[PDB]
Amino acid sequence: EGVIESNWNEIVDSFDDMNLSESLLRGIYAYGFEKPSAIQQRAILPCIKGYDVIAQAQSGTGKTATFAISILQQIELDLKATQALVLAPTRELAQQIQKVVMALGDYMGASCHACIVQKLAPHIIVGTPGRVFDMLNRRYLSPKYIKMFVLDEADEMLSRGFKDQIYDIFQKLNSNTQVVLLSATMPSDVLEVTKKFMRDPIRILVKKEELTLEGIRQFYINVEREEWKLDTLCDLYETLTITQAVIFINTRRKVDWLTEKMHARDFTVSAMHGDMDQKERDVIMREFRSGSSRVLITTDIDVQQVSLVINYDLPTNRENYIHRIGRGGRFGRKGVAINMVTEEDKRTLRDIETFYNTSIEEMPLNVADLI
Amino acid sequence: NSLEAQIRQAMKTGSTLTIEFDQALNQKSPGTLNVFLHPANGGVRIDLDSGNQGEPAKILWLPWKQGELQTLQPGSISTVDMLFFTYYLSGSKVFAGDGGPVWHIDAPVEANQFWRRMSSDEWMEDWEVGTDRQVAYLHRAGQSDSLWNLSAYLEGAAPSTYGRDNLGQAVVGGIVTGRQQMSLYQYATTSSGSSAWSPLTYTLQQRKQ
């Protein structure tokens, strides 16, 4: 799910027309192997030609034959040295790679060892970054004939803190080393690795939405009229047990208004808006994180946990809706959001689920026994 | 005199010295990172800007990342006296293995979930069921047990905590003392202001599964 964006057009959907060697194909057909993904279908060819490649492949590509093929087709089978080096974030992923690489490899007489002792020079080495850096360091492996460096799941590896080890390993490799990075995610630092290590590489990216609504319970209250919002907001603090909350407001004027009325009801509050510099926000975020204020009121945030988010004002568009309550990452997919709805909102937006493209349900009475 | 020495000093002597971090740091993966330390209020700001009386430094950095765990690998812990920092704890947790990794876990990530993601790490795979490791663990007090209680997975002293009633912030830091060896420190920021630095202790923990 998503859409491919490439700077290179060179597709192949079969093992048949990849210009592979015979012993490789003997291996491919021997073990009925799967078809390659759309991503892989456009990476495999320039990859075989030795070009630098950035492929936004889904996690687990290391298990597949196309992955193995991209490595085996480049190996001088008669040179008895390590020519390819694959880094994976964990033992299980390295073993999966080792398994499929050595399966196909056997028909070709290629060797593949997974670094995860005395025996150590196989053509291909796959393993964890630290373990692998260590082996180069203690000279049990040689970067001398290594012409290919694969970073499978670069994102996972950076997340698991192997950036250091990865940069140190790179410094030991020849200048003409083909780099192939695979990552389902392309955050800033992953992009940096490629800028640092690659020369005009093939780019096969997938534009992916970074914030998501997944697992966030979304409610709305028919407040009907603007002037009944303050009361509605105060009743929520009597219906629910709220530790800290973020209240989004559309204008600086109302931010100031709401913090005055809220403060008059003995809420500790922090107000923030666009006509404030970064040094003034910092002090305000400092007070919210510390819990000196139980309520943060802003316009269109640096904090890890809050009881819920309240859209006191409905956001002007979907992008804003997602920047307000959407969360990044695969885990900790929980949250509670409450939207306040007036008749004018309903008359303008027509249908909020459609307008904001998500599932928002009317806040029930038993809401406290639900979130 | 150098901002790096003063922090190191404040941590060891148990003095009060607050740390500010640029959100931009969280775009930098866990590892060895060159930063600039600047005086800010009576504390120190850490960022990537060379100006405003910025003194360079080389530290061990560990970012925060929403919906995820970030990890600092033991193989990075080697230069004696190097400082270590992780982004502000405002609900999140920090788990540290002695001779092992440091994990910054996002707040709502359930304990069952992050434990499973941690176990994937090499150091955890070597931690045989039925044996011990030394662990420094810190969560916000009053937070729901679903987000941090690891009693089904470990037998040992209770984790350290910060704040009260799931309110408060913490700043975790360190000083490398040797190869895969680091002294951890913490200070809290609540409605009473900021406390002084105190050791973040490692206790013995037995792996139950």
mmCIF file of all heavy atoms in Angstrom, chain B residues 102-147:
data_model
loop_
_atom_site.group_PDB
_atom_site.id
_atom_site.type_symbol
_atom_site.label_atom_id
_atom_site.label_comp_id
_atom_site.label_asym_id
_atom_site.label_seq_id
_atom_site.Cartn_x
_atom_site.Cartn_y
_atom_site.Cartn_z
ATOM 1 N N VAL B 102 21.243 0.437 26.166
ATOM 2 C CA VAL B 102 20.359 1.380 26.837
ATOM 3 C C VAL B 102 19.191 1.575 25.860
ATOM 4 O O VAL B 102 19.411 1.848 24.678
ATOM 5 C CB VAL B 102 21.022 2.726 27.207
ATOM 6 C CG1 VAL B 102 20.033 3.639 27.927
ATOM 7 C CG2 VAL B 102 22.277 2.563 28.040
ATOM 8 N N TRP B 103 17.968 1.389 26.369
ATOM 9 C CA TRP B 103 16.730 1.510 25.600
ATOM 10 C C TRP B 103 15.853 2.678 26.082
ATOM 11 O O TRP B 103 15.458 2.737 27.244
ATOM 12 C CB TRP B 103 15.918 0.220 25.736
ATOM 13 C CG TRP B 103 16.391 -0.967 24.972
ATOM 14 C CD1 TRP B 103 16.088 -1.268 23.679
ATOM 15 C CD2 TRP B 103 17.174 -2.061 25.460
ATOM 16 N NE1 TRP B 103 16.651 -2.464 23.319
ATOM 17 C CE2 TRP B 103 17.337 -2.968 24.387
ATOM 18 C CE3 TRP B 103 17.829 -2.324 26.658
ATOM 19 C CZ2 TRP B 103 18.083 -4.145 24.497
ATOM 20 C CZ3 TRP B 103 18.573 -3.475 26.760
ATOM 21 C CH2 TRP B 103 18.686 -4.382 25.705
ATOM 22 N N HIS B 104 15.546 3.602 25.174
ATOM 23 C CA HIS B 104 14.552 4.650 25.435
ATOM 24 C C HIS B 104 13.203 4.175 24.856
ATOM 25 O O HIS B 104 13.069 4.121 23.654
ATOM 26 C CB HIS B 104 14.964 5.957 24.763
ATOM 27 C CG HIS B 104 14.136 7.112 25.197
ATOM 28 N ND1 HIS B 104 14.702 8.225 25.778
ATOM 29 C CD2 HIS B 104 12.796 7.287 25.204
ATOM 30 C CE1 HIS B 104 13.746 9.076 26.072
ATOM 31 N NE2 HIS B 104 12.556 8.525 25.722
ATOM 32 N N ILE B 105 12.232 3.798 25.691
ATOM 33 C CA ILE B 105 10.960 3.259 25.209
ATOM 34 C C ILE B 105 9.866 4.329 25.236
ATOM 35 O O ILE B 105 9.569 4.813 26.307
ATOM 36 C CB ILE B 105 10.494 2.075 26.068
ATOM 37 C CG1 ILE B 105 11.488 0.917 26.113
ATOM 38 C CG2 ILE B 105 9.115 1.614 25.624
ATOM 39 C CD1 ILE B 105 12.472 0.995 27.261
ATOM 40 N N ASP B 106 9.184 4.598 24.113
ATOM 41 C CA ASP B 106 8.114 5.592 24.123
ATOM 42 C C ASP B 106 7.065 5.172 25.168
ATOM 43 O O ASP B 106 6.749 3.989 25.311
ATOM 44 C CB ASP B 106 7.500 5.817 22.742
ATOM 45 C CG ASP B 106 6.513 6.971 22.647
ATOM 46 O OD1 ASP B 106 6.579 7.902 23.444
ATOM 47 O OD2 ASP B 106 5.661 6.916 21.772
ATOM 48 N N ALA B 107 6.540 6.174 25.885
ATOM 49 C CA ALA B 107 5.594 6.055 27.008
ATOM 50 C C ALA B 107 4.456 5.051 26.807
ATOM 51 O O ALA B 107 4.337 4.127 27.595
ATOM 52 C CB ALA B 107 5.046 7.431 27.317
ATOM 53 N N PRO B 108 3.547 5.211 25.811
ATOM 54 C CA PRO B 108 2.412 4.296 25.656
ATOM 55 C C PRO B 108 2.760 2.899 25.125
ATOM 56 O O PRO B 108 1.840 2.055 25.026
ATOM 57 C CB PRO B 108 1.480 4.977 24.644
ATOM 58 C CG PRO B 108 2.375 5.933 23.892
ATOM 59 C CD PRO B 108 3.555 6.268 24.779
ATOM 60 N N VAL B 109 4.033 2.661 24.763
ATOM 61 C CA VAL B 109 4.410 1.348 24.298
ATOM 62 C C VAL B 109 4.308 0.414 25.504
ATOM 63 O O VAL B 109 4.941 0.640 26.537
ATOM 64 C CB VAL B 109 5.797 1.312 23.646
ATOM 65 C CG1 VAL B 109 6.179 -0.109 23.253
ATOM 66 C CG2 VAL B 109 5.869 2.223 22.443
ATOM 67 N N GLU B 110 3.430 -0.582 25.377
ATOM 68 C CA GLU B 110 3.140 -1.539 26.439
ATOM 69 C C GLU B 110 4.399 -2.339 26.789
ATOM 70 O O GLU B 110 5.206 -2.605 25.949
ATOM 71 C CB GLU B 110 2.004 -2.473 26.029
ATOM 72 C CG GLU B 110 0.588 -1.947 26.275
ATOM 73 C CD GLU B 110 -0.331 -3.126 26.599
ATOM 74 O OE1 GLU B 110 -0.380 -4.092 25.775
ATOM 75 O OE2 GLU B 110 -0.849 -3.179 27.760
ATOM 76 N N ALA B 111 4.536 -2.697 28.061
ATOM 77 C CA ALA B 111 5.641 -3.487 28.598
ATOM 78 C C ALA B 111 5.776 -4.821 27.862
ATOM 79 O O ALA B 111 6.863 -5.274 27.594
ATOM 80 C CB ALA B 111 5.379 -3.748 30.061
ATOM 81 N N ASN B 112 4.656 -5.501 27.623
ATOM 82 C CA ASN B 112 4.699 -6.783 26.916
ATOM 83 C C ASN B 112 5.304 -6.544 25.526
ATOM 84 O O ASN B 112 6.179 -7.275 25.083
ATOM 85 C CB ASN B 112 3.317 -7.444 26.865
ATOM 86 C CG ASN B 112 2.833 -7.870 28.234
ATOM 87 O OD1 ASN B 112 3.635 -8.195 29.113
ATOM 88 N ND2 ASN B 112 1.531 -7.922 28.418
ATOM 89 N N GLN B 113 4.878 -5.465 24.871
ATOM 90 C CA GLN B 113 5.343 -5.150 23.550
ATOM 91 C C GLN B 113 6.852 -4.855 23.557
ATOM 92 O O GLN B 113 7.591 -5.511 22.826
ATOM 93 C CB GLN B 113 4.558 -3.968 22.977
ATOM 94 C CG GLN B 113 4.918 -3.617 21.531
ATOM 95 C CD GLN B 113 4.314 -4.597 20.556
ATOM 96 O OE1 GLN B 113 4.978 -5.478 20.004
ATOM 97 N NE2 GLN B 113 3.007 -4.496 20.420
ATOM 98 N N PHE B 114 7.323 -3.910 24.382
ATOM 99 C CA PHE B 114 8.742 -3.521 24.285
ATOM 100 C C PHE B 114 9.665 -4.649 24.757
ATOM 101 O O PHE B 114 10.828 -4.723 24.364
ATOM 102 C CB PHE B 114 9.027 -2.163 24.949
ATOM 103 C CG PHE B 114 9.066 -2.078 26.454
ATOM 104 C CD1 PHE B 114 10.187 -2.486 27.147
ATOM 105 C CD2 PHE B 114 8.031 -1.479 27.166
ATOM 106 C CE1 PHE B 114 10.249 -2.372 28.527
ATOM 107 C CE2 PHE B 114 8.107 -1.329 28.544
ATOM 108 C CZ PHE B 114 9.218 -1.779 29.226
ATOM 109 N N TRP B 115 9.167 -5.520 25.622
ATOM 110 C CA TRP B 115 9.973 -6.604 26.092
ATOM 111 C C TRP B 115 10.256 -7.531 24.909
ATOM 112 O O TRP B 115 11.400 -7.860 24.641
ATOM 113 C CB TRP B 115 9.277 -7.322 27.241
ATOM 114 C CG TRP B 115 10.028 -8.516 27.733
ATOM 115 C CD1 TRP B 115 9.768 -9.821 27.452
ATOM 116 C CD2 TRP B 115 11.198 -8.495 28.552
ATOM 117 N NE1 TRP B 115 10.682 -10.611 28.077
ATOM 118 C CE2 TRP B 115 11.575 -9.829 28.747
ATOM 119 C CE3 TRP B 115 11.947 -7.481 29.144
ATOM 120 C CZ2 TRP B 115 12.665 -10.184 29.529
ATOM 121 C CZ3 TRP B 115 13.040 -7.824 29.910
ATOM 122 C CH2 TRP B 115 13.384 -9.159 30.102
ATOM 123 N N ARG B 116 9.200 -7.912 24.199
ATOM 124 C CA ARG B 116 9.323 -8.670 22.998
ATOM 125 C C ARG B 116 10.289 -7.982 21.999
ATOM 126 O O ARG B 116 11.117 -8.652 21.375
ATOM 127 C CB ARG B 116 7.945 -8.845 22.373
ATOM 128 C CG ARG B 116 8.003 -9.532 21.026
ATOM 129 C CD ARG B 116 6.612 -9.630 20.459
ATOM 130 N NE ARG B 116 6.656 -10.186 19.117
ATOM 131 C CZ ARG B 116 5.584 -10.340 18.362
ATOM 132 N NH1 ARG B 116 4.403 -10.014 18.855
ATOM 133 N NH2 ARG B 116 5.695 -10.795 17.127
ATOM 134 N N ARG B 117 10.228 -6.656 21.828
ATOM 135 C CA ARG B 117 11.154 -6.005 20.854
ATOM 136 C C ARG B 117 12.578 -6.012 21.418
ATOM 137 O O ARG B 117 13.500 -6.267 20.682
ATOM 138 C CB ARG B 117 10.687 -4.611 20.417
ATOM 139 C CG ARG B 117 9.287 -4.591 19.809
ATOM 140 C CD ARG B 117 9.079 -5.514 18.607
ATOM 141 N NE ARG B 117 7.672 -5.898 18.444
ATOM 142 C CZ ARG B 117 7.170 -6.684 17.470
ATOM 143 N NH1 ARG B 117 7.956 -7.170 16.518
ATOM 144 N NH2 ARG B 117 5.874 -6.986 17.460
ATOM 145 N N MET B 118 12.748 -5.814 22.731
ATOM 146 C CA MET B 118 14.070 -5.863 23.343
ATOM 147 C C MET B 118 14.749 -7.238 23.167
ATOM 148 O O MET B 118 15.934 -7.305 22.836
ATOM 149 C CB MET B 118 13.976 -5.547 24.833
ATOM 150 C CG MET B 118 13.909 -4.077 25.108
ATOM 151 S SD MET B 118 13.396 -3.692 26.800
ATOM 152 C CE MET B 118 14.719 -4.421 27.763
ATOM 153 N N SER B 119 14.000 -8.329 23.361
ATOM 154 C CA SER B 119 14.523 -9.698 23.351
ATOM 155 C C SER B 119 15.234 -10.052 22.037
ATOM 156 O O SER B 119 16.079 -10.917 21.994
ATOM 157 C CB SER B 119 13.416 -10.634 23.647
ATOM 158 O OG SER B 119 12.499 -10.590 22.570
ATOM 159 N N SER B 120 14.855 -9.374 20.952
ATOM 160 C CA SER B 120 15.499 -9.493 19.622
ATOM 161 C C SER B 120 16.987 -9.115 19.670
ATOM 162 O O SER B 120 17.735 -9.544 18.808
ATOM 163 C CB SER B 120 14.830 -8.576 18.634
ATOM 164 O OG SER B 120 13.434 -8.811 18.595
ATOM 165 N N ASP B 121 17.376 -8.246 20.614
ATOM 166 C CA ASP B 121 18.745 -7.743 20.732
ATOM 167 C C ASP B 121 19.704 -8.840 21.226
ATOM 168 O O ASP B 121 19.396 -9.618 22.147
ATOM 169 C CB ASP B 121 18.805 -6.498 21.614
ATOM 170 C CG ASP B 121 20.170 -5.839 21.589
ATOM 171 O OD1 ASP B 121 21.096 -6.361 22.295
ATOM 172 O OD2 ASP B 121 20.310 -4.828 20.838
ATOM 173 N N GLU B 122 20.895 -8.848 20.618
ATOM 174 C CA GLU B 122 21.956 -9.834 20.836
ATOM 175 C C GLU B 122 22.210 -10.078 22.332
ATOM 176 O O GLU B 122 22.214 -11.252 22.808
ATOM 177 C CB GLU B 122 23.177 -9.331 20.079
ATOM 178 C CG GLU B 122 24.392 -10.223 20.167
ATOM 179 C CD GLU B 122 25.281 -10.079 18.936
ATOM 180 O OE1 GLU B 122 24.760 -10.289 17.762
ATOM 181 O OE2 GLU B 122 26.466 -9.712 19.133
ATOM 182 N N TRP B 123 22.376 -8.970 23.063
ATOM 183 C CA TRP B 123 22.655 -9.007 24.479
ATOM 184 C C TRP B 123 21.536 -9.731 25.233
ATOM 185 O O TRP B 123 21.805 -10.466 26.183
ATOM 186 C CB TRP B 123 22.891 -7.601 25.023
ATOM 187 C CG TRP B 123 23.232 -7.563 26.479
ATOM 188 C CD1 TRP B 123 24.478 -7.608 27.021
ATOM 189 C CD2 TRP B 123 22.323 -7.389 27.578
ATOM 190 N NE1 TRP B 123 24.415 -7.448 28.378
ATOM 191 C CE2 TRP B 123 23.102 -7.330 28.753
ATOM 192 C CE3 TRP B 123 20.943 -7.204 27.682
ATOM 193 C CZ2 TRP B 123 22.543 -7.160 30.018
ATOM 194 C CZ3 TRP B 123 20.394 -7.025 28.933
ATOM 195 C CH2 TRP B 123 21.181 -7.011 30.082
ATOM 196 N N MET B 124 20.289 -9.518 24.809
ATOM 197 C CA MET B 124 19.141 -10.208 25.441
ATOM 198 C C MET B 124 19.167 -11.705 25.075
ATOM 199 O O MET B 124 18.906 -12.536 25.923
ATOM 200 C CB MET B 124 17.794 -9.591 25.047
ATOM 201 C CG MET B 124 17.559 -8.190 25.597
ATOM 202 S SD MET B 124 17.169 -8.014 27.368
ATOM 203 C CE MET B 124 15.554 -8.787 27.411
ATOM 204 N N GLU B 125 19.523 -12.050 23.837
ATOM 205 C CA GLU B 125 19.545 -13.449 23.447
ATOM 206 C C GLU B 125 20.592 -14.223 24.260
ATOM 207 O O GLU B 125 20.352 -15.380 24.582
ATOM 208 C CB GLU B 125 19.708 -13.558 21.942
ATOM 209 C CG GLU B 125 18.527 -12.937 21.264
ATOM 210 C CD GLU B 125 18.288 -13.320 19.830
ATOM 211 O OE1 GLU B 125 19.049 -14.141 19.289
ATOM 212 O OE2 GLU B 125 17.311 -12.787 19.275
ATOM 213 N N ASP B 126 21.691 -13.565 24.641
ATOM 214 C CA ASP B 126 22.706 -14.184 25.486
ATOM 215 C C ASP B 126 22.252 -14.281 26.968
ATOM 216 O O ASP B 126 22.799 -15.063 27.754
ATOM 217 C CB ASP B 126 24.018 -13.413 25.379
ATOM 218 C CG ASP B 126 24.635 -13.439 23.989
ATOM 219 O OD1 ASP B 126 24.028 -14.063 23.067
ATOM 220 O OD2 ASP B 126 25.713 -12.809 23.831
ATOM 221 N N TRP B 127 21.267 -13.478 27.389
ATOM 222 C CA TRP B 127 20.775 -13.497 28.772
ATOM 223 C C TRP B 127 19.862 -14.714 28.946
ATOM 224 O O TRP B 127 18.659 -14.685 28.702
ATOM 225 C CB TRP B 127 20.123 -12.152 29.107
ATOM 226 C CG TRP B 127 19.597 -12.006 30.498
ATOM 227 C CD1 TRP B 127 19.842 -12.787 31.594
ATOM 228 C CD2 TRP B 127 18.898 -10.857 30.989
ATOM 229 N NE1 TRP B 127 19.237 -12.260 32.702
ATOM 230 C CE2 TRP B 127 18.666 -11.067 32.364
ATOM 231 C CE3 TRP B 127 18.415 -9.693 30.378
ATOM 232 C CZ2 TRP B 127 17.964 -10.154 33.145
ATOM 233 C CZ3 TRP B 127 17.714 -8.792 31.151
ATOM 234 C CH2 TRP B 127 17.493 -9.020 32.519
ATOM 235 N N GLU B 128 20.497 -15.810 29.349
ATOM 236 C CA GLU B 128 19.858 -17.095 29.474
ATOM 237 C C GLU B 128 18.745 -17.043 30.529
ATOM 238 O O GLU B 128 18.921 -16.429 31.589
ATOM 239 C CB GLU B 128 20.987 -18.076 29.788
ATOM 240 C CG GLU B 128 20.590 -19.535 29.932
ATOM 241 C CD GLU B 128 21.809 -20.431 30.150
ATOM 242 O OE1 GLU B 128 22.841 -20.177 29.480
ATOM 243 O OE2 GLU B 128 21.759 -21.339 31.035
ATOM 244 N N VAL B 129 17.593 -17.663 30.231
ATOM 245 C CA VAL B 129 16.516 -17.774 31.206
ATOM 246 C C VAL B 129 17.045 -18.518 32.430
ATOM 247 O O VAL B 129 17.503 -19.636 32.282
ATOM 248 C CB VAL B 129 15.286 -18.535 30.670
ATOM 249 C CG1 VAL B 129 14.312 -18.896 31.786
ATOM 250 C CG2 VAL B 129 14.565 -17.759 29.583
ATOM 251 N N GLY B 130 16.893 -17.927 33.623
ATOM 252 C CA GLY B 130 17.298 -18.535 34.907
ATOM 253 C C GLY B 130 18.539 -17.886 35.496
ATOM 254 O O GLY B 130 18.943 -18.242 36.560
ATOM 255 N N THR B 131 19.141 -16.927 34.784
ATOM 256 C CA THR B 131 20.359 -16.238 35.210
ATOM 257 C C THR B 131 20.074 -14.741 35.422
ATOM 258 O O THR B 131 18.969 -14.240 35.155
ATOM 259 C CB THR B 131 21.479 -16.476 34.189
ATOM 260 O OG1 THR B 131 21.186 -15.742 32.994
ATOM 261 C CG2 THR B 131 21.677 -17.949 33.887
ATOM 262 N N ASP B 132 21.093 -14.002 35.867
ATOM 263 C CA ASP B 132 20.936 -12.606 36.189
ATOM 264 C C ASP B 132 21.691 -11.668 35.235
ATOM 265 O O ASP B 132 22.645 -12.030 34.574
ATOM 266 C CB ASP B 132 21.515 -12.291 37.573
ATOM 267 C CG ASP B 132 20.937 -13.040 38.766
ATOM 268 O OD1 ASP B 132 19.798 -13.570 38.672
ATOM 269 O OD2 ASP B 132 21.645 -13.090 39.803
ATOM 270 N N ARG B 133 21.195 -10.427 35.202
ATOM 271 C CA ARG B 133 21.872 -9.296 34.612
ATOM 272 C C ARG B 133 21.644 -8.149 35.586
ATOM 273 O O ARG B 133 20.806 -8.272 36.483
ATOM 274 C CB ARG B 133 21.421 -8.983 33.189
ATOM 275 C CG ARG B 133 21.878 -10.021 32.174
ATOM 276 C CD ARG B 133 23.388 -10.025 32.003
ATOM 277 N NE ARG B 133 23.779 -10.900 30.915
ATOM 278 C CZ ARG B 133 23.893 -12.215 31.014
ATOM 279 N NH1 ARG B 133 23.594 -12.819 32.149
ATOM 280 N NH2 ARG B 133 24.272 -12.911 29.956
ATOM 281 N N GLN B 134 22.485 -7.126 35.478
ATOM 282 C CA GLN B 134 22.349 -5.930 36.266
ATOM 283 C C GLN B 134 21.599 -4.959 35.366
ATOM 284 O O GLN B 134 21.999 -4.714 34.224
ATOM 285 C CB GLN B 134 23.704 -5.411 36.752
ATOM 286 C CG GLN B 134 24.331 -6.285 37.837
ATOM 287 C CD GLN B 134 23.780 -6.048 39.226
ATOM 288 O OE1 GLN B 134 23.366 -6.976 39.925
ATOM 289 N NE2 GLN B 134 23.739 -4.793 39.641
ATOM 290 N N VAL B 135 20.506 -4.426 35.904
ATOM 291 C CA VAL B 135 19.628 -3.593 35.168
ATOM 292 C C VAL B 135 19.325 -2.316 35.939
ATOM 293 O O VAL B 135 19.073 -2.381 37.101
ATOM 294 C CB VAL B 135 18.315 -4.351 34.920
ATOM 295 C CG1 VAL B 135 17.315 -3.494 34.133
ATOM 296 C CG2 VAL B 135 18.574 -5.705 34.257
ATOM 297 N N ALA B 136 19.335 -1.197 35.220
ATOM 298 C CA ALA B 136 18.903 0.125 35.677
ATOM 299 C C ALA B 136 17.616 0.413 34.902
ATOM 300 O O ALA B 136 17.609 0.405 33.677
ATOM 301 C CB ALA B 136 19.956 1.185 35.421
ATOM 302 N N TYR B 137 16.516 0.558 35.618
ATOM 303 C CA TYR B 137 15.238 0.747 34.996
ATOM 304 C C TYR B 137 14.518 1.896 35.705
ATOM 305 O O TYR B 137 14.523 2.000 36.975
ATOM 306 C CB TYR B 137 14.477 -0.576 34.988
ATOM 307 C CG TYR B 137 13.148 -0.511 34.278
ATOM 308 C CD1 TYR B 137 13.030 0.121 33.053
ATOM 309 C CD2 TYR B 137 12.038 -1.173 34.770
ATOM 310 C CE1 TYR B 137 11.829 0.151 32.365
ATOM 311 C CE2 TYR B 137 10.834 -1.168 34.085
ATOM 312 C CZ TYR B 137 10.726 -0.504 32.876
ATOM 313 O OH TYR B 137 9.552 -0.477 32.184
ATOM 314 N N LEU B 138 13.932 2.767 34.875
ATOM 315 C CA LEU B 138 13.286 4.011 35.310
ATOM 316 C C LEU B 138 11.978 4.263 34.534
ATOM 317 O O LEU B 138 11.994 4.334 33.301
ATOM 318 C CB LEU B 138 14.278 5.159 35.070
ATOM 319 C CG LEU B 138 13.741 6.569 35.354
ATOM 320 C CD1 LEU B 138 13.473 6.768 36.847
ATOM 321 C CD2 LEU B 138 14.705 7.626 34.838
ATOM 322 N N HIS B 139 10.874 4.439 35.277
ATOM 323 C CA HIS B 139 9.567 4.755 34.718
ATOM 324 C C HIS B 139 8.912 5.901 35.513
ATOM 325 O O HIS B 139 9.308 6.241 36.619
ATOM 326 C CB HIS B 139 8.723 3.489 34.685
ATOM 327 C CG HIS B 139 8.184 3.107 36.013
ATOM 328 N ND1 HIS B 139 6.955 3.565 36.463
ATOM 329 C CD2 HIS B 139 8.671 2.309 36.982
ATOM 330 C CE1 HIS B 139 6.710 3.062 37.656
ATOM 331 N NE2 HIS B 139 7.738 2.267 37.990
ATOM 332 N N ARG B 140 7.902 6.544 34.947
ATOM 333 C CA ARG B 140 7.226 7.591 35.712
ATOM 334 C C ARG B 140 6.313 6.920 36.759
ATOM 335 O O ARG B 140 5.616 5.985 36.459
ATOM 336 C CB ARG B 140 6.460 8.550 34.800
ATOM 337 C CG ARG B 140 5.832 9.729 35.539
ATOM 338 C CD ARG B 140 5.571 10.954 34.668
ATOM 339 N NE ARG B 140 4.665 10.642 33.572
ATOM 340 C CZ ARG B 140 4.340 11.473 32.585
ATOM 341 N NH1 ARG B 140 4.907 12.664 32.507
ATOM 342 N NH2 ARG B 140 3.408 11.107 31.714
ATOM 343 N N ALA B 141 6.397 7.387 38.009
ATOM 344 C CA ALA B 141 5.555 6.923 39.145
ATOM 345 C C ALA B 141 4.095 7.244 38.835
ATOM 346 O O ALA B 141 3.786 8.327 38.270
ATOM 347 C CB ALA B 141 5.961 7.604 40.445
ATOM 348 N N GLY B 142 3.207 6.314 39.196
ATOM 349 C CA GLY B 142 1.763 6.498 39.025
ATOM 350 C C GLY B 142 1.304 6.105 37.636
ATOM 351 O O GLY B 142 0.138 6.006 37.380
ATOM 352 N N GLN B 143 2.235 5.885 36.718
ATOM 353 C CA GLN B 143 1.867 5.454 35.383
ATOM 354 C C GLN B 143 1.234 4.068 35.466
ATOM 355 O O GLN B 143 1.606 3.267 36.312
ATOM 356 C CB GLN B 143 3.102 5.354 34.490
ATOM 357 C CG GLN B 143 2.772 5.006 33.051
ATOM 358 C CD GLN B 143 3.972 5.280 32.180
ATOM 359 O OE1 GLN B 143 4.974 4.552 32.230
ATOM 360 N NE2 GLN B 143 3.854 6.341 31.385
ATOM 361 N N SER B 144 0.311 3.783 34.550
ATOM 362 C CA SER B 144 -0.328 2.467 34.468
ATOM 363 C C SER B 144 0.719 1.350 34.260
ATOM 364 O O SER B 144 1.620 1.442 33.417
ATOM 365 C CB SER B 144 -1.339 2.456 33.387
ATOM 366 O OG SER B 144 -1.569 1.114 32.999
ATOM 367 N N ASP B 145 0.557 0.270 35.021
ATOM 368 C CA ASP B 145 1.452 -0.879 35.042
ATOM 369 C C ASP B 145 1.604 -1.549 33.682
ATOM 370 O O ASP B 145 2.621 -2.183 33.453
ATOM 371 C CB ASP B 145 1.020 -1.935 36.058
ATOM 372 C CG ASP B 145 1.375 -1.524 37.472
ATOM 373 O OD1 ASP B 145 0.948 -0.410 37.853
ATOM 374 O OD2 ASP B 145 2.168 -2.276 38.145
ATOM 375 N N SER B 146 0.596 -1.423 32.824
ATOM 376 C CA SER B 146 0.616 -1.967 31.485
ATOM 377 C C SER B 146 1.782 -1.364 30.683
ATOM 378 O O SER B 146 2.341 -2.009 29.800
ATOM 379 C CB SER B 146 -0.690 -1.670 30.819
ATOM 380 O OG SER B 146 -0.984 -0.280 30.932
ATOM 381 N N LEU B 147 2.189 -0.145 31.027
ATOM 382 C CA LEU B 147 3.224 0.498 30.321
ATOM 383 C C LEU B 147 4.618 0.216 30.907
ATOM 384 O O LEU B 147 5.602 0.576 30.280
ATOM 385 C CB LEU B 147 2.895 1.990 30.318
ATOM 386 C CG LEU B 147 1.529 2.330 29.711
ATOM 387 C CD1 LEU B 147 1.273 3.821 29.751
ATOM 388 C CD2 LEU B 147 1.431 1.817 28.283
#
